[PDB]
Amino acid sequence: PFFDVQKRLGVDLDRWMTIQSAEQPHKIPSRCHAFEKEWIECAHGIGSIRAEKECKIEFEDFRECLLRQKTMKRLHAIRRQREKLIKEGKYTPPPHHS
Amino acid sequence: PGIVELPSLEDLKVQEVKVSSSVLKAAAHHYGAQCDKPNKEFMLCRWEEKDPRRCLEEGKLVNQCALEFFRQIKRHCAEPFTEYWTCIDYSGLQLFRRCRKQQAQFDECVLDKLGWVRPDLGDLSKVTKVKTDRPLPENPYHSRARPEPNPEVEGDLKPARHGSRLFFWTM
Amino acid sequence: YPTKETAHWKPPPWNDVDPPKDTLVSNLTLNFGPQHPAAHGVLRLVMELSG
Amino acid sequence: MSMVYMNIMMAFTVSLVGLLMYRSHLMSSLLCLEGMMLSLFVMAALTILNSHFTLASMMPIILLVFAACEAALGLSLLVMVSNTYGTDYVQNLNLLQC
Amino acid sequence: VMKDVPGWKVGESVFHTTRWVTPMMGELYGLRASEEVLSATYGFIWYT
Amino acid sequence: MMTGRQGRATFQFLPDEARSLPPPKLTDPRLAFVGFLGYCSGLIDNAIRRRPVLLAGLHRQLLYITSFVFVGYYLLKRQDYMYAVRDHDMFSYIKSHPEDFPEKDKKTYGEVFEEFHPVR
Amino acid sequence: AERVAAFLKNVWAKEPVLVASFAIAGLAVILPTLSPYTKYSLMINRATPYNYPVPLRDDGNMPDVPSHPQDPQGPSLEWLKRL
Amino acid sequence: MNPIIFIIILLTIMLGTIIVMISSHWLLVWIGFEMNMLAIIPIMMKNHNPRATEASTKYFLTQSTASMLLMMAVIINLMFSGQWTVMKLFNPMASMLMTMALAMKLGMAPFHFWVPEVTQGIPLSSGLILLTWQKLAPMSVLYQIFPSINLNLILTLSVLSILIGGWGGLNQTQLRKIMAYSSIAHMGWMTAVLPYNPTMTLLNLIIYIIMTSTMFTMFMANSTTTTLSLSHTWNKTPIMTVLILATLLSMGGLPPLSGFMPKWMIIQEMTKNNSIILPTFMAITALLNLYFYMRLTYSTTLTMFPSTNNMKMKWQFPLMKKMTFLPTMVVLSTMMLPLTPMLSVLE
Amino acid sequence: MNLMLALLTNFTLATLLVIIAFWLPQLNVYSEKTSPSARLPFSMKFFLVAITFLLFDLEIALLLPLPWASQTANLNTMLTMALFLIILLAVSLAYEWTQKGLEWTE
Amino acid sequence: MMLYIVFILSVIFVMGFVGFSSKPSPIYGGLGLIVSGGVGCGIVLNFGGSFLGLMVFLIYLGGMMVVFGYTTAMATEQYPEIWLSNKAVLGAFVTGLLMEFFMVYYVLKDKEVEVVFEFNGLGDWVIYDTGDSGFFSEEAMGIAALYSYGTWLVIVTGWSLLIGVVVIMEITRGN
Ligand SMILES: CCCCCCCCCCCCCCCCCC(=O)OC[C@H](COP(=O)(O)OCCN)OC(=O)CCCCCCCCCCCCCCCCC
Ligand SMILES: CCCCCCCCCCCCCCCCCC(=O)OC[C@H](COP(=O)(O)OCCN)OC(=O)CCCCCCCCCCCCCCCCC
């Protein structure tokens, strides 16, 4: 905050909703709770200039959980390869998968 | 990145409890009292390990306890129990309060023939403590080592040397 | 710095008020008859309304 | 990103272009403004729902409430313009040129 | 399927961490019939 | 640059560590100038309201001087605190990173060669 | 007083709907702070188990934590059965 | 307006800005802008004429478009970081959108066209709020996200604002249009130094507000809104012409006046970062503003324009406008350069 | 699926009834007849009732979660904020009422 | 094809937007937005946002858009020009549907397109969560928390709505 009145007065006006790994009703966890926790703890206290370099592994995993860009790339490759072989009759789906 | 380790299909094989949800609902209160120990060990494992691959042995013991629990009912109390869960199954919401007469017949049977006492209101929601030999996981999140904090600034605060030192100002 | 593209420009009003000359016609005129002609039938009422 | 985001982001872009390219009716431009909010509401809801960010579930409601209140203010100004000139044409709002 | 794809490692993780990650719907039902996938994805939302 | 200081007690005009610094002297020339500005504001107040500039409302002129001097005193305390903190941070960093601030082995002019550029 | 009572008479004669509205709203704001059963609403909401009760690892010195659900230790719902 | 309602509306304008300034959550920042916009529209409409309605409509359209772009940036930031904390943004597209949204709210060039028109169309007191208090919230946001701002974008907006503000003011005879272009030009200085030292952004903002507040207050004291109506002041309140002269020279950045201080401190910070060309260009271009400030001083204080006969009737009555804080503001607007090191209180 | 089928069926039938309501009279082949923007002027009052409905309707959006909100452990906070919302809804009405925002006389 | 319900709805969502963004007569502009809103709610429902979806219908369609149409009738339009009977309106509409058609073509064929962001065309179902067996609606729990966690949000949101009533009465009085 520009003026950190919340910290001075010790009153929580809007921090409770800033991150998804904060306390939730009925302890419902967000899908990426573990990744966000690990990134936040890695980067805590060291400042953003250092964090952009020293917590890159945590942030990359957190970003993968959020948007699943690399998971979808790997699924698309398998599906693309699979339909190629089914066209050429060099592969047959098993009984399950059908 | 590494190769995700997965158990073999044979390692995952167990005798399942192939009964319907109305059967499970009808037996749930006695099942919760009788099979508490293996169930609570399994749940302690799942929350501590945070990995289903690390609790497969405890998960199998959950099935075996359940199967032995239902074999006891099939052995001494099948007819009262069958009547009870057939009433539960009729309701779209599987309501307990519609079948108190058949519940009483089943509860009376298991108390006489097995000694089972139905847990009271609130009992099954207690937090309990479980004995276990599985050691407490050390790094369940597989966290890397944390970055080192910046050196602390310490010492006594002294006035600035020759003041602000802004251009020509002497203070 | 006057130019050909600002020749038509004029200083604004001294008190910032432009006259209201555009559209102000709020009085409806209604030729009013009875909803059902069973009883009155032959009443024509030229009414001027304001809301 | 997932495929749905492409279309929701297109909808925001379309309504933004519609907002910045006026015709005559001031009303037609306010609708584009409300269209922008609708696409924001949908994109926010999809992100929050899919991630199971529980406490953020209330955010789309606050967005809708504040944007509707701002739309009421916009409609009130349009009515005052229509009272002055008898139409909501934006070409009559050129007094301040000088 | 990926036997002859060059450079492919079978079962490789996309995360740096070796921690268990809950799979998403595509990872579980990625290679299956549309009926089962449809039931798993929208069955609850579409039930009355 | 100093927004995230490790020992920044946030949103505090004068944190407690500032009490270790000597206070501004009530005869500080900067405080005297602040009082003078207050006196000028009092004269301007008379002028714009067409009262006799020097004599009118001496009570009002006094409150102009007092309020400027009063606010000026605390602003100087913070000013001196912020420069003390800047120096404290600078010297701590230099100590923590001696490899970045080496003492130079510095020669006499008898040894260093400087080119001569005649002015003719 | 009696000025106050006269004023309440004039509104009860002219604006009975508003008198009823302010009376009902006033009870809504006052009675909860005075009711003795308000405390039970909080207790009942906390006795409803939405989540699984994760067991604790028994270090060996938690006397007040039951080992089995039917053991005497732990919070009771006896007050709720009677209420 | 009912005076109590006018007070509540002003307090809500302030509350919206305060919410932006204390919020750690992007949604609360957005709410603060929404609350602020809602409360300021009535004060623009309060004199009920077609020009005030046009200005209110133009302002509403500009601010609402900006606020939708701000929300778009926040949501994109959520998608790529999963959090709402007011801090550096985690996506370059979100950064560009928020920077443009805040530039639109500030009236920076080339998003500037609304500032001259909206200021001209509203009363002087409303223009004072628009050109001073309304800058606080967008600046407070820029102050917190600057590490993620594209350097070329923010410097481009700054250069254009200084150029457009300087050139736009040259062709003006209306006081409210002059102050609008002066505001645009001064905006470019604040953002130009932001990447290097945000503290000097705050210094320039504070001094700009004080000088602008002084100018509007003196224009309100005599109910002057044009150059020629201001040229009568010498024959009514001579002291006001001297005060106007000092403030205009200060706004021109002339030593030894207060307005030189922000220009002086910004040049220093940019040169420490090996930015020589840009501060030199900015300093030279600022001479445009000095020119149309000096033109005002010529018609107000340094010469005597023709008066009217009916001005004699005004001699018999006193100034009864409040002119709140004017003696203090005019002194701070001119005589603060010797206290320049006090800028460290902003650190 | 069922809800989509129901909505499709309901609006499909409504559509068929509408078109046959428009075509069936053409069986008669009735004779040809050969014999027949801007303000309205709109009253400000009718605009202000619509706007008031909207602002009141937005406050109702905030009150809809009340049945779920009562399940919380922090009942004192929940009850305080619930009554706060309804009271501000009443204060909006009181302000409208006492400035003659609810009148129909010109 | 039912497994791409979300994508199909989002295509209709964009088409409705191109509807009112080409800005035909305000009467038909409101119709495009109403259809887009209804489709928008449909997309939110299929992500598990039942309460959020119904809010769109109740508040956005049954509230805000009713007032827009009300105001359009009184202050703007009384009869409309035929939709797509104007050069710019039709050209804008054609342009929008061509851009939408090509985005849809490449995303389906290459299973991926790239404009500012990278988009994947496998199907929106692939990102869904595979673990659900709680005895409540998470969305409802989050919204209900407004009154426990969100005290500050309620105050400022409540204040803004009250000020909205005051401001609009000020604006429309005319003196
Ligand atoms: C007890 C009552 C309650 C109020 C008490 C408050 C008093 C303090 C407030 C400030 C007032 C200072 C005293 C002002 C005296 C004015 C007297 C006056 O007006 O008479 C005029 C006098 C003689 O002039 P005359 O000969 O009659 O005519 C000449 C024609 N040209 O001309 C003069 O001789 C006037 C001389 C100039 C006035 C003195 C200048 C003071 C400068 C103050 C500097 C401030 C520095 C602050 C630093 C503080 C730091 C700690
Ligand atoms: C402290 C370090 C920093 C130093 C920076 C410089 C500080 C000075 C700036 C202070 C702020 C400006 C206020 C200065 C006070 C001005 C006082 C004054 O000029 O007298 C006003 C005079 C009175 O006119 P009247 O109403 O008829 O009263 C007759 C009196 N018996 O009115 C008139 O008679 C009209 C005069 C005709 C116009 C003359 C124009 C030239 C004015 C020269 C003074 C302006 C100085 C400002 C520029 C800075 C100079 C360095």
Give the 3-state secondary structure of chain J.
CHHHHHHHHHHHHHHHHHHHHCCCCHHHHHHHHHHHHHHHHHHHHCCCCHHHHHHHHHHHHHHHHHHHHHHHHHHHCCCCCCCCCCHHHHHHHHHHHHHHHHHHHHHHHCCEEEECEEEECCCHHHHCECCCCCCCCHHHHHHHHHHCCCHHHHHHHHHHHHHHHHHHHHHHHCC
CA dihedral H155, H156, H159, H162 (to 10 degrees): -100
Cβ pair I54, D72 in contact under 8 A: yes
Instruction: Evaluate whether residue J88 is within a structural domain.
Output: yes
- Residue type for B156, please? D
Contacts for J37-40: CB closer than 8 Å, 24+ residues apart: J37/D38, J37/J61, J37/J65, J39/J9, J39/J12, J39/J13, J40/D38, J40/D39, J40/D41, J40/D42, J40/J13
Amino acid at J42: G
Q: Please state at what angle helix J26-45 crosses helix J5-21, rounded to 10 degrees.
A: 160
**How many angstroms separate the Cα of B149 from the Cα of each of A44, A57, F1, H151?**
9, 18, 18, 29
Which residue, judged by its Cα, is nearest atom 16 of ligand 2? Answer: H242
Q: Are F83 and B164 in contact, with CB atoms under 8 Å apart? A: yes
Rounded Cα distance between D23 and D20, Å, is: 10
Q: Is the CB of H246 under 6 A from ligand 2?
A: yes
Q: Which residues of F55-88 are buried (b: 16+ CB within 10 A; e: fewer)?
A: ebeeeebeebbeebbeebbebbbbbbbbbbbbbb
Instruction: Quote the tokens at residue B20.
Output: 């319907």
Question: b/e per residue, H182-212, with b = 16+ CB within 10 A?
Answer: bbbbbbbbbbbbbbbbbbbbbbbbebbbbbb
> Are chains D and A touching, using the cut-off of 8 Å on CB pairs and a minimum of 3 such pairs?
yes
Q: Please report how the helices H175-193 and H124-131 are oriented relative to each other, as an axis angle in degrees rounded to 10.
A: 10
Closest CA to I68 of G45, G27, A29, J155: G45
Question: How crowded is the C-beta side of A91, counted as CA atoms within 13 Å?
Answer: 16
Q: Which of H240, H338, H342 sits opposite F75 (nearest CB)?
A: H342
Q: Environment class of residue F4 by beta-carbon count within 10 Å: exposed (0-12), middle (13-18) or buried (19+)?
A: exposed
| Four-point Cα dihedral I5, I8, I13, I19, nearest 10 | -160
Among J126, G70, J106, B4, smallest CA distance to E26 is for: J126
Experimentally, the structure was elucidated by cryo-EM
Q: DSSP string of H270-318?
A: HHHTT--HHHHHHHHHTHHHHHHHHHHHIIIIIS-----TTHHHHTTS-
The dihedral region occupied by H150, where left means phi > 0, alpha psi between -120 and 50, and beta the remainder, is beta
Instruction: Report the CATH number at residue J72.
Output: 1.20.120.1200
Contact D5, J7 (CB under 8 A): no
Q: Is H255 in the pocket of ligand 2 (CB under 6 A)?
A: no
Residue H70 contacts residue H98 (beta carbons within 8 Å): yes
User: Do residues J119 and A65 touch, judged by C-beta distance below 8 A?
Assistant: no
Residues present in chain I in total: 106
Angle between helices G16-34 and I75-98 (to 10 degrees): 160
With left for phi above 0 and alpha for psi between -120 and 50, is residue A27 left, alpha or beta?
left
The subunits that touch chain B, with at least 3 C-beta pairs less than 8 Å apart, are: A, E, F, G, H
User: Nearest Cα to J168, choosing from D63, H41, B138, C6?
Assistant: H41
DSSP string, B73-131: HHHH-HHHHHHHHHHHHHSTT--GGG-HHHHHHHHHHHHHHH---PPPTTGGGS--EE-
Q: Which residue has the tokens 């001196």?
A: F80
Count of positions (residues) in chain D: 98
What sign does the dihedral H183-H187-H190-H193 (CA atoms) show? negative
Both tokens assigned to H339: 């206290």
Residues belonging to chain H? 347
CA-nearest of H139, H194, H21 to A4 is H21
- At residue H226, the 3 state secondary structure works out as strand
Is G52 in the J-facing interface, judged by CB distances under 8 Å? no
Chain A residues closer than 8 Å to B149 by CB: 45-46
CA distance C10 to C17: 14
Residue J28, domain member (yes or no): yes
Residues facing residue J114 across a β-bridge: J118
Class of domain D3-85: mainly alpha
> Ligand nearest F39 Cα, by number?
1
Among residues H28, H45, H130, H139, which one has the least CA distance to residue H86? Answer: H28
Using a CB-CB distance cutoff of 8 angstroms, which residues of chain B are in contact with residue E10? 3
Domain ranges of chain D: 3-85
3-state class (DSSP) for residue H69: helix
Asked whether residue J54 is assigned to any structural domain, the reply reads: yes
Give every CB contact of residue E8 below 8 A, 6+ residues apart in sequence: A77, E2
Is H261:H340 a contact under the CB 8 Å cutoff?
yes
Angle at B141 between CA B135 and CA B146, to 5 degrees: 115
I7-98: in CATH 1.20.58.1610? yes
Q: Which of H113, C26, I57, J78 is nearest to D27 (CA)?
A: J78
Counting ligands in written order, the one closest to the CA of H331 is 2
Q: How many domains does chain J fold into? A: 1
> Which residues touch I32 (CB under 8 Å, ≥6 apart)?
none
> Rounded to the nearest 5°, which phi and psi values hold at J149?
-80, -35
- For residues H63 and H105, the answer to whether their CB atoms sit within 8 Å is yes
Range of the structural domain that residue J113 is part of: 4-169
Compute φ and ψ for B130, nearest 5 degrees.
Answer: -125, 140
How far apart are the C-alpha atoms of H106 and H135, rounded to whole Å?
6
The packing angle between helices H198-221 and H175-193, to 10°, is 170
Nearest 5°: the CA angle J107, J109, J112 is 40
- The helix or strand, by DSSP H or E, that contains position G78, with its residue range, turns out to be helix G78-82
CA-closest residue to ligand 1 atom 34: F54
Give the whole-angstrom CA distance, residue G4 versus residue I104: 33
Least CB-CB distance to D3: which of J22, J75, J121? J121
Crossing angle of the two packed helices H326-334 and H198-221, in degrees rounded to 10: 130
> Which one, of H30, H2, H33, lies nearest residue H15 by Cα?
H33
CA pair distance I79, G42, nearest whole angstrom: 12
* Distance from C-alpha of H171 to C-alpha of H218, rounded to nearest angstrom: 22
Gyration radius of chain G's alpha carbons: 25
C-alpha of F53 from chain center: 32
* Contact present, J120 and A69 (Cβ < 8 Å): yes
Q: Which H or E run contains B40?
A: helix B36-49
Pairing of strands B129-130, G56-57: parallel
Contact between chains at B160 and F22 (C-beta distance less than 8 A)? no
Q: Of H257, H52, H219, nearest to H128 (Cα)?
A: H219
Residue H239 near ligand 2, beta carbon < 6 Å: yes
- Domain assignment present for residue J116? The answer is yes
Chain J residues near residue H39 by CB distance under 8 angstroms: 163, 167
Q: What is the resolution of this structure in A?
A: 2.3
Q: Residue whose CA is closest, atom 41 of ligand 1?
A: F39
| Residue J85, in any domain of the structure | yes
Both tokens of residue J113? 């397109």
Q: Which two tokens stand for residue H88?
A: 């550096």
What does the angle CA H133 – CA H134 – CA H135 come to, to the nearest 5 degrees?
A: 90
Look at the alpha carbons of C4, C10, C16, C21 in this order and tell me if their dihedral is positive or negative.
negative
Burial class (CB in 10 A: 0-12, 13-18, 19+), H52: buried
- Ligand closest to CA F41: 2
Chains D and I touch (3+ CB pairs under 8 A): yes
C-beta separation of F26 from F36 below 8 A: no
Enter the DSSP assignment of F97.
-
Dihedral sign of CA atoms J43, J47, J51, J52 in order: negative
| b/e code H155-176 from CB counts within 10 Å (16+ = b) | bebbbbbbbbbbebbeebebbb
| I13: closest CA of chain J, how far (Å) | 20
